[PDB]
């Protein structure tokens, strides 16, 4: 990649530019968005982002030692297709 | 979960509410944000969201039939910790 790592800060700048919205506002939106995705996953919600992918909490049964649960992302078809060479 | 599936549309509403920003603006920001994450992954960038997790393109070598590549998400520690029971 020309830019090897794109950060949250880089994305705020790119989104401010693309939308013409204030950087201060985009920054507040991104932090709130991630907080709300977290909150939803903590409640056991699926977080479905049409056209992008789904976050969900997956479980490992105790057999697997004790039962555990963890966050995961299932990429959508559009995203899978765009990342193919 | 009280809300079994949280959608992109639900998140726009939750973020508008939390930030006091206009729904039209939050909607534009979210669509741009996801587009820019996609674009970065298509270029082979890592997308690092401090405090949330990292998206990256992973490869399967041809041995595995032909070589393939696919998007993946590695959740960060904070998110992993919040999703534990």
Curated annotation (Swiss-Prot), chains A, B:
Key words of the record? DNA condensation, DNA-binding
Q: Which stretches are annotated as coiled coil? A: none
GO annotation terms (biological process): chromosome condensation
Cysteine disulfide partners in this protein: none
**Family annotation (Pfam families):** Bac_DNA_binding
Under the heading SUPFAM superfamilies, the entry gives: IHF-like DNA-binding proteins (SSF47729)
Which Gene Ontology cellular-component terms appear in the entry? cytosol
Specify the superkingdom: Bacteria
Please give one Gene Ontology molecular function term for this protein: DNA binding
Q: SMART domains, per this entry?
A: BHL (SM00411)
The answer to whether keyword Magnesium applies is no
Quote the InterPro entries the UniProt record gives.
Answer: Hist_DNA-bd (IPR000119), Histone-like_DNA-bd_CS (IPR020816), IHF-like_DNA-bd_dom_sf (IPR010992)
Q: How does it assemble?
A: Has been isolated in complexes with 5S rRNA and bL25, and with 5S rRNA, bL25 and uL5. Homodimer.
What does the sequence similarity comment in the record state about its family?
Belongs to the bacterial histone-like protein family.
Q: Give the protein's function.
A: Histone-like DNA-binding protein which is capable of wrapping DNA to stabilize it, and thus to prevent its denaturation under extreme environmental conditions.
Q: What is this protein called?
A: DNA-binding protein HU
Q: What organism does the record attribute this protein to?
A: Thermus thermophilus (strain ATCC 27634 / DSM 579 / HB8)
């Amino acid at each position: 990649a020309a830019k090897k790592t794109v950060t949250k800060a880089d994305l705020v700048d790119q989104v401010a530019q693309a939308t013409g919205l204030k950087k201060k506002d985009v920054k507040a939106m991104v932090d709130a968005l991630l907080a709300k995705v977290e909150e939803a996953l903590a409640n056991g919600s699926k977080v479905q982002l049409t056209g992008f992918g789904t976050f969900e909490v997956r479980k490992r049964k105790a057999r697997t030692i004790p039962a555990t649960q963890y966050p995961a992302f299932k990429p959508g078809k559009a995203l899978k297709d765009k990342v193919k060479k």
